[PDB]
Amino acid sequence: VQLVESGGGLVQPGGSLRLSCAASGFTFSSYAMSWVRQAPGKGLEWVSAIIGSGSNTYYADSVKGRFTISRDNAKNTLYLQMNSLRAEDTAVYYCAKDTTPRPLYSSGWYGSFDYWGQGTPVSV
Amino acid sequence: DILFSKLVTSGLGTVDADYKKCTKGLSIADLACAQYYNGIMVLPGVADA
Amino acid sequence: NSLNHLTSQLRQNFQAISSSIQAIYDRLDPPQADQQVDRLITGRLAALN
Amino acid sequence: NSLNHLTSQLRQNFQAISSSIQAIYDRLDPPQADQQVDRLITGRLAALN
Amino acid sequence: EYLQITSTPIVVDCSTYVCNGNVRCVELLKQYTSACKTIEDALRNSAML
Amino acid sequence: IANIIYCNSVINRLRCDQLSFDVPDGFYSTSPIQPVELPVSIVSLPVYHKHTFIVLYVNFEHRRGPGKCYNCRPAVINITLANFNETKGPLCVDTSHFTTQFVDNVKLARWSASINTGNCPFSFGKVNNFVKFGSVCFSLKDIPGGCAMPIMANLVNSKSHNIGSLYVSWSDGDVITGVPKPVEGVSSFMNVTLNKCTKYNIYDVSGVGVIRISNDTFLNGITYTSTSGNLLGFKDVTNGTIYSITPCNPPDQLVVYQQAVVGAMLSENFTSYGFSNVVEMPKFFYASNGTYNCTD
Amino acid sequence: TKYNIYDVSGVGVIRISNDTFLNGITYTSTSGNLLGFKDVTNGTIYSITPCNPPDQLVVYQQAVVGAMLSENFTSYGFSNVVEMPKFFYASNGTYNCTD
Amino acid sequence: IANIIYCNSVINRLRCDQLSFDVPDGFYSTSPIQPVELPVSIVSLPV
Amino acid sequence: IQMTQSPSSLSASVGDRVTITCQASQDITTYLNWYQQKPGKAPKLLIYDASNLETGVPSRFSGSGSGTDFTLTISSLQPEDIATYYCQQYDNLFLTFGGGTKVEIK
Amino acid sequence: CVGHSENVFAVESGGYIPSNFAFNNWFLLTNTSSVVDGVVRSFQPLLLNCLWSVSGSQFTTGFVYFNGTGRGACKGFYSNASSDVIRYNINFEENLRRGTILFKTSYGAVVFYCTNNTLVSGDAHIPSGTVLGNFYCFVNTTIGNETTSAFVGALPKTVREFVISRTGHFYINGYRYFSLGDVEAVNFNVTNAATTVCTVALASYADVLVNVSQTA
Ligand SMILES: *[C@@H]1O[C@H](CO)[C@@H](O[C@@H]2O[C@H](CO)[C@@H](O[C@@H]3O[C@H](CO[C@H]4O[C@H](CO)[C@@H](O)[C@H](O)[C@@H]4O)[C@@H](O)[C@H](O[C@H]4O[C@H](CO)[C@@H](O)[C@H](O)[C@@H]4O)[C@@H]3O)[C@H](O)[C@H]2NC(C)=O)[C@H](O)[C@H]1NC(C)=O
Ligand SMILES: *[C@@H]1O[C@H](CO)[C@@H](O[C@@H]2O[C@H](CO)[C@@H](O[C@@H]3O[C@H](CO)[C@@H](O)[C@H](O[C@H]4O[C@H](CO)[C@@H](O)[C@H](O)[C@@H]4O)[C@@H]3O)[C@H](O)[C@H]2NC(C)=O)[C@H](O)[C@H]1NC(C)=O
Ligand SMILES: *[C@@H]1O[C@H](CO)[C@@H](O[C@@H]2O[C@H](CO)[C@@H](O[C@@H]3O[C@H](CO)[C@@H](O)[C@H](O)[C@@H]3O)[C@H](O)[C@H]2NC(C)=O)[C@H](O)[C@H]1NC(C)=O
Ligand SMILES: *[C@@H]1O[C@H](CO)[C@@H](O[C@@H]2O[C@H](CO)[C@@H](O[C@@H]3O[C@H](CO)[C@@H](O)[C@H](O)[C@@H]3O)[C@H](O)[C@H]2NC(C)=O)[C@H](O)[C@H]1NC(C)=O
Ligand SMILES: *[C@@H]1O[C@H](CO)[C@@H](O[C@@H]2O[C@H](CO)[C@@H](O)[C@H](O)[C@H]2NC(C)=O)[C@H](O)[C@H]1NC(C)=O
Ligand SMILES: *[C@@H]1O[C@H](CO)[C@@H](O[C@@H]2O[C@H](CO)[C@@H](O)[C@H](O)[C@H]2NC(C)=O)[C@H](O)[C@H]1NC(C)=O
Ligand SMILES: *[C@@H]1O[C@H](CO)[C@@H](O[C@@H]2O[C@H](CO)[C@@H](O)[C@H](O)[C@H]2NC(C)=O)[C@H](O)[C@H]1NC(C)=O
Ligand SMILES: *[C@@H]1O[C@H](CO)[C@@H](O[C@@H]2O[C@H](CO)[C@@H](O)[C@H](O)[C@H]2NC(C)=O)[C@H](O)[C@H]1NC(C)=O
Ligand SMILES: *[C@@H]1O[C@H](CO)[C@@H](O[C@@H]2O[C@H](CO)[C@@H](O)[C@H](O)[C@H]2NC(C)=O)[C@H](O)[C@H]1NC(C)=O
Ligand SMILES: *[C@@H]1O[C@H](CO)[C@@H](O[C@@H]2O[C@H](CO)[C@@H](O)[C@H](O)[C@H]2NC(C)=O)[C@H](O)[C@H]1NC(C)=O
Ligand SMILES: *[C@@H]1O[C@H](CO)[C@@H](O[C@@H]2O[C@H](CO)[C@@H](O)[C@H](O)[C@H]2NC(C)=O)[C@H](O)[C@H]1NC(C)=O
Ligand SMILES: *[C@@H]1O[C@H](CO)[C@@H](O[C@@H]2O[C@H](CO)[C@@H](O)[C@H](O)[C@H]2NC(C)=O)[C@H](O)[C@H]1NC(C)=O
Ligand SMILES: *[C@@H]1O[C@H](CO)[C@@H](O[C@@H]2O[C@H](CO)[C@@H](O)[C@H](O)[C@H]2NC(C)=O)[C@H](O)[C@H]1NC(C)=O
Ligand SMILES: *[C@@H]1O[C@H](CO)[C@@H](O[C@@H]2O[C@H](CO)[C@@H](O)[C@H](O)[C@H]2NC(C)=O)[C@H](O)[C@H]1NC(C)=O
Ligand SMILES: *[C@@H]1O[C@H](CO)[C@@H](O)[C@H](O)[C@H]1NC(C)=O
Ligand SMILES: *[C@@H]1O[C@H](CO)[C@@H](O)[C@H](O)[C@H]1NC(C)=O
Ligand SMILES: *[C@@H]1O[C@H](CO)[C@@H](O)[C@H](O)[C@H]1NC(C)=O
Ligand SMILES: *[C@@H]1O[C@H](CO)[C@@H](O)[C@H](O)[C@H]1NC(C)=O
Ligand SMILES: *[C@@H]1O[C@H](CO)[C@@H](O)[C@H](O)[C@H]1NC(C)=O
Ligand SMILES: *[C@@H]1O[C@H](CO)[C@@H](O)[C@H](O)[C@H]1NC(C)=O
Ligand SMILES: *[C@@H]1O[C@H](CO)[C@@H](O)[C@H](O)[C@H]1NC(C)=O
């Protein structure tokens, strides 16, 4: 199992980015995914999560309405769209994989991330 | 013999099975004996050489 | 030989509930009895072929 | 007669839920749809015989 | 000019081919009263003639 | 193993498909490979629309107390069917459209619910692909004359357990249909792609093919089918334009001589199978690597 | 004997063969029938044959006058058995015949 | 009942199996009856 | 949901019996995860469901608790265990992590 | 008819259509796909109780009942007994873009109309996926004081024939689009009247063998 993130960089306040995370070594469409960030020298904060199908998407209130999560099951790629960034949004963003496989016709719970990516920096 | 051997010999086809070796079988049954076990019998050629 | 074979195939059930077409409509509803009668139709047409 | 009989046999279900292979895979799960499509394969191969 | 005068004769034991010697299967086969007899006479008479 | 051949080249694929190491001289039909990614096209007549959502909730939790056994079978199961009000009988669908949804509401990690086909002619998640019905009713208790769908509780790298079932009844008809889900913005009535191989659902007929615009000014009907039942074309009810349907990969005919492929009969202008020259005959196109100066 | 060899069931006769097949532990045919198996610990390959292969009875003027057999024995009550290029034949024939 | 044949002798078995009281001259395939006292043989991978 | 872990930091000798707690300020029943993040690397899952030991971490670790109180213990603190530990609930899909806790050898 | 009077004929004794009729705008009915070319057998409403002309023959038809009342001066053989189908032969390229069709049932009055302006249909649900400004067709249902408007669907640009069954099956150009339920009478009150309707024929089902070429 392997996760690799990309798309980090430096953008002005109010800018936008196209964070991406490729997945390999497991059936991608069976597991929910979530992005979690770590501010410099701070604890982990959950940002957004998406189930396997993609019908349900959840966002934390600090990011609600500004970001947009998506996934493309055809080529095992998880995306995160950042819009109207602020100063406190700067952090290291990790893409995580849940531990519970679920059928593609189901919508379900999540929250036991067993694998994590290397993380990518985002500065504003 | 040119038309019988130089042309493709039907070793992959309807060889009249030797029933004498199939039942006693000191070796694993060949293609001819295997067909015989399924009730398929190939009789000897009518036009003897 | 062909006539006796042709007439004896009418006893076959073809995995249906019964070989009698009337015995099916007298024991099953119209939508489910049709799928059973269809087995008799296909089986008997094969016998004719 | 032979060509019309061959083209018309594609309308038969052969005890499957439908005569359209695509409609089966849209309606059933992969493991259960194969059991339905296998009926159309055997029925259509018999039509060619 | 080449002309064919013989075809390698093949005969089958109908009971062995369909039941593989299973005793219960042979009992079920007898209900198909004229099924195996028609097949064996067709192959036997043609080979003898 | 004595010798092997890889089914990589065109001649090798023909040898592998023919299950033989040598192929006699002659003509052999073959079919090009189908595109692996197909867009979706949907055509449907607008009708009086009301939408019912059939939702099944599954949740279970272990026996709280001194013995915490994770691998054990769950004991207490909560299974609900939304508006299913017990004594009133099966929850029947009155709306023209309906959608089935599954909510795996368990919180325990590595535990996940599932539903299986059982003895029904359709699956829970697969009804949404435009399946027609004359009537349909769901219930958590056995319906006399219906079918049963097992509900299962699964644990990763462990054996699963049945935790109930869903009972369905139905009849054939054209009044009720299942749809994936309403999404504001998409027209489910005329949204098609042209000249590309696509999977389509056109007026209750499902298939895979290519759609183009055509001459035909046929006045009667909206769908046209062949003797075999395949759909040959359809009419857009608004404009009145008639579109044709063609299979994505019709069969070709390869010519093999001296254990090699020397030519290929094609239905169109292309240098298919690697031949560098193509000509046109009265009934078909021919492609070969020949110089066209021989006599015999 | 009724057998269950490596989860494959059937009825047949098991005997010892002199084959040296290196691959696998179970051998089948084009029909899927079990033809033999290998003992993983002992090294010997054993063959399998049905208990009752088909014979051919010769009938003439409503009587059974001969029988083609697959082994050299006096089956069906005949007294004399002779050798032929591909089968054995048994009958009370005295072979003092020409037609 | 007009007449009966018992399916005991080798010739009678063929007549009974052919469902006919008369059999034309020729070659007829047949199989010996299977024994009913069958022992059991089991071979399995040591696990 | 809020989580608070005590102590914010701790230090113990090799082979000792370090114990770190976490509380949920709300009934979580049993839905708690324990992670470990070594400096400069991605976190790893140690315990799920508050007590189920993961398949790739040694039995030195253990976890227990229910309702509002939870606890993670290291039976014999080895030098490889210097890291930051976090507790994370999943009773609500808007899941939250704790503030962390750092260990130290002496 | 369209004055061509090749479409107006005299019914033969027993209700049979003459063998030399051109069948102009006489569509094959179906609940599914239409045959293009071939020979097909089906139950079709082609046994005419009696048929009459309306283009140039005067006598506005108004309401026509299924049980015989409201018929015009039908030509040739004519009969009583209730018919199960009423056929309206429409002239060249006429369209139901204005005017209405009224129906009478055992439970009240019904009218069929079709437009794009939300004022003419008042409150009616239209699906979230249609095209604004395109013509859509609706239906009023009156129970004496209350009038429930409802959306039924969309119709082609031009109509050549309108067929209504006693059981509410609504065929346009040979295809069934709606099912209004039991209906006792109809009135093709559509504008451009006396010229929009060519012929009206009361008909009943009969078993027939049909030569079809280019879906006609
Ligand atoms: C589109 O799809 C619809 C589905 O609704 C089809 O509708 C069916 O059409 C068929 C046409 O044959 C109808 O079947 C006919 O019913 C008539 C009913 O009238 C008598 O029967 C009932 C019995 O309950 C009595 O109550 C009633 O008073 C009448 O006595 C029968 O007339 C028909 O057959 C009988 O009459 C004929 C007369 O010519 C005789 O020759 C026959 O022997 C027999 O006595 C026939 O049974 C069916 O009822 C319709 N169903 C519905 C639900 O509407 C459309 O036809 C289809 N369109 C196309 C083009 O296929
Ligand atoms: C099923 O329906 C089809 C379609 O209507 C029908 O096919 C038509 O048959 C007619 C008669 O054979 C064909 O018309 C002929 O075509 C050529 C055109 O060059 C002419 O040689 C013929 O002329 C004859 O008829 C003239 C009057 O039209 C006479 O004046 C003249 O002297 C000739 O006798 C003739 O017109 C026609 O082409 C086809 N139509 C199509 C579309 O193919 C078919 O016969 C019907 N079958 C059944 C069994 O009902
Ligand atoms: C078994 O599971 C079902 C499905 O979750 C439980 O039903 C749910 O019960 C809760 C509490 O009553 C409902 O929440 C409340 O719903 C109403 C909606 O009118 C609202 O007034 C409240 O704000 C609150 O959200 C929840 O909606 C309901 N869900 C469904 C689908 O019915 C049920 O209680 C569980 N039963 C047991 C015994 O565990
Ligand atoms: C089918 O029934 C509907 C419902 O009655 C008819 O639609 C329109 O409905 C409104 C409200 O009932 C009618 O009232 C009028 O509305 C307008 C807009 O406020 C206003 O100008 C008038 O003062 C009055 O309140 C309206 O009359 C009616 N529309 C029309 C064009 O008459 C609909 O008309 C019915 N279908 C047909 C073909 O008549
Ligand atoms: C026709 O279908 C296509 C494909 O489903 C629709 O395009 C989708 O539109 C939604 C809404 O913008 C996007 O989220 C999807 O990702 C699009 N799908 C693809 C494959 O790109 C299109 O909206 C449909 N409708 C019309 C009227 O063209
Ligand atoms: C088939 O395709 C070939 C290659 O595209 C066409 O070849 C040339 O096309 C032009 C334009 O039509 C002709 O003027 C040339 O004479 C053709 N050259 C050769 C070497 O073939 C060919 O015309 C196409 N034919 C059809 C019927 O579509
Ligand atoms: C027909 O001629 C073409 C000419 O293009 C041959 O194509 C070459 O095939 C080889 C492999 O055999 C490739 O390495 C070359 O790159 C191809 N192109 C050229 C321009 O040489 C083709 O092999 C021939 N095919 C047959 C079946 O005879
Ligand atoms: C296994 O035994 C069989 C007995 O038939 C051997 O096959 C015979 O081999 C000899 C030479 O050793 C030939 O002359 C015979 O013609 C063969 N028999 C037949 C029926 O043709 C076989 O060689 C033995 N094999 C091994 C590996 O020991
Ligand atoms: C069939 O069985 C008979 C009896 O055992 C065999 O006849 C003997 O063969 C041996 C050699 O194998 C001779 O020494 C004897 O003299 C033979 N006769 C008798 C009466 O014992 C015969 O060879 C066997 N044939 C086959 C093909 O197996
Ligand atoms: C073939 O000949 C044998 C010779 O043994 C016959 O066997 C005798 O069969 C009778 C019953 O028919 C017994 O009573 C005798 O004891 C048997 N042995 C002898 C030595 O006579 C056998 O019947 C003959 N079979 C045929 C079909 O002709
Ligand atoms: C089967 O039994 C029938 C009925 O007895 C036999 O047919 C009769 O045989 C006698 C012989 O004397 C003839 O005279 C009769 O004309 C026949 N028919 C009838 C209707 O009586 C038949 O021969 C028997 N067949 C066998 C093979 O046993
Ligand atoms: C045909 O049906 C109608 C409707 O039932 C019958 O009723 C007459 O309908 C007309 C027009 O609506 C009214 O003017 C009459 O007052 C109605 N009469 C009665 C007695 O209700 C009509 O009589 C029927 N005709 C036939 C010949 O059956
Ligand atoms: C309803 O549909 C009609 C369709 O014709 C629209 O009316 C047309 O409007 C255009 C200008 O946009 C004019 O050029 C045409 O002449 C009009 N048609 C006729 C027949 O005169 C109409 O705008 C649509 N919308 C509404 C709200 O009524
Ligand atoms: C058929 O349509 C015409 C045209 O709209 C209707 O005639 C109008 O009817 C209303 C009825 O209240 C009158 O107020 C108008 O003055 C009429 N004239 C015109 C020129 O529109 C006719 O009544 C309709 N038929 C039915 C049965 O309602
Ligand atoms: C549920 O069923 C009960 C039992 O008959 C009935 O009284 C009640 O009206 C139903 N409705 C609801 C909303 O519970
Ligand atoms: C379309 O137009 C005519 C009339 O149908 C037809 O003969 C012609 O072949 C068609 N056109 C093309 C471009 O193939
Ligand atoms: C229908 O009509 C429009 C407007 O004339 C035209 O541009 C379009 O190509 C036609 N087809 C579809 C599918 O909209
Ligand atoms: C064509 O073939 C002839 C006859 O063999 C030969 O002489 C001639 O040179 C060839 N021409 C070409 C262009 O290959
Ligand atoms: C297998 O070897 C064992 C142990 O020496 C012996 O008992 C047995 O008879 C052998 N069988 C064969 C076929 O070699
Ligand atoms: C054997 O046949 C000959 C003729 O071939 C005959 O004369 C003789 O009687 C027969 N019997 C014996 C025992 O020789
Ligand atoms: C139909 O009934 C009317 C009124 O009784 C009568 O004048 C007419 O002749 C009748 N026609 C037939 C064919 O019965």
Side-chain angles (χ1 to χ4, degrees), chain F:
Chain F
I1 294 183
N3 48 286
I4 69 170
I5 57 172
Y6 299 86
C7 312
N8 48 9
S9 73
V10 55
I11 173 56
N12 285 341
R13 233 184 313 292
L14 186 59
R15 285 157 85 199
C16 296
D17 291 350
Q18 223 84 0
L19 235 293
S20 99
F21 271 97
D22 73 356
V23 285
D25 303 275
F27 301 80
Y28 293 84
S29 40
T30 201
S31 282
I33 191 60
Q34 190 162 111
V36 86
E37 213 72 357
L38 312 189
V40 296
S41 295
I42 304 164
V43 181
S44 194
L45 290 175
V47 286
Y48 180 72
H49 157 256
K50 295 254 289 313
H51 206 290
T52 291
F53 288 84
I54 296 294
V55 193
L56 172 69
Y57 298 88
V58 176
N59 179 45
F60 52 79
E61 86 279 32
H62 259 311
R63 181 188 46 52
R64 174 288 325 310
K68 173 134 147 164
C69 170
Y70 214 53
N71 305 5
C72 289
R73 178 217 166 97
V76 58
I77 322 293
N78 178 353
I79 303 193
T80 87
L81 192 67
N83 302 17
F84 173 69
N85 161 254
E86 175 60 308
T87 84
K88 270 42 178 170
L91 165 60
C92 294
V93 172
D94 320 61
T95 37
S96 55
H97 289 194
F98 78 93
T99 289
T100 61
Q101 297 190 357
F102 199 89
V103 185
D104 181 15
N105 214 25
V106 314
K107 298 193 185 183
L108 294 141
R110 301 196 181 292
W111 281 93
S112 173
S114 179
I115 183 162
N116 300 342
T117 310
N119 59 314
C120 305
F122 51 82
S123 290
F124 198 69
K126 307 302 299 293
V127 169
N128 304 301
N129 302 321
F130 304 104
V131 185
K132 307 300 294 280
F133 296 103
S135 60
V136 58
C137 316
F138 309 83
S139 152
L140 295 174
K141 331 159 55 53
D142 189 20
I143 293 143
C147 71
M149 266 155 88
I151 300 168
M152 293 246 171
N154 312 291
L155 196 277
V156 182
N157 62 256
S158 276
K159 155 270 199 203
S160 53
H161 319 268
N162 172 284
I163 60 159
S165 55
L166 181 62
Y167 306 92
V168 199
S169 59
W170 81 101
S171 80
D172 301 1
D174 60 354
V175 49
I176 313 198
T177 179
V179 297
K181 207 212 216 302
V183 165
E184 304 57 2
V186 293
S187 185
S188 58
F189 308 131
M190 191 68 190
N191 186 42
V192 300
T193 187
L194 302 182
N195 309 290
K196 297 206 62 210
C197 182
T198 170
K199 188 190 190 301
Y200 62 84
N201 194 292
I202 295 167
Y203 301 126
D204 301 3
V205 185
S206 181
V208 174
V210 176
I211 311 175
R212 326 181 156 92
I213 292 166
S214 79
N215 280 20
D216 304 305
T217 65
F218 301 148
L219 296 163
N220 190 300
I222 56 171
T223 53
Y224 312 104
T225 50
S226 62
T227 284
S228 302
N230 301 339
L231 184 70
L232 298 179
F234 73 95
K235 184 183 288 155
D236 159 29
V237 75
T238 64
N239 272 355
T241 292
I242 302 186
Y243 300 81
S244 69
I245 283 156
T246 308
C248 295
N249 54 317
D252 297 318
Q253 290 246 335
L254 302 194
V255 188
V256 307
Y257 174 62
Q258 294 299 116
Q259 294 300 320
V261 189
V262 301
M265 269 137 302
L266 312 174
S267 84
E268 73 304 0
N269 242 326
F270 284 103
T271 37
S272 303
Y273 303 93
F275 294 113
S276 64
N277 170 34
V278 56
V279 308
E280 152 156 47
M281 306 310 298
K283 288 297 194 17
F284 47 81
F285 290 92
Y286 185 82
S288 67
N289 243 12
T291 66
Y292 291 83
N293 157 20
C294 353
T295 46
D296 62 301

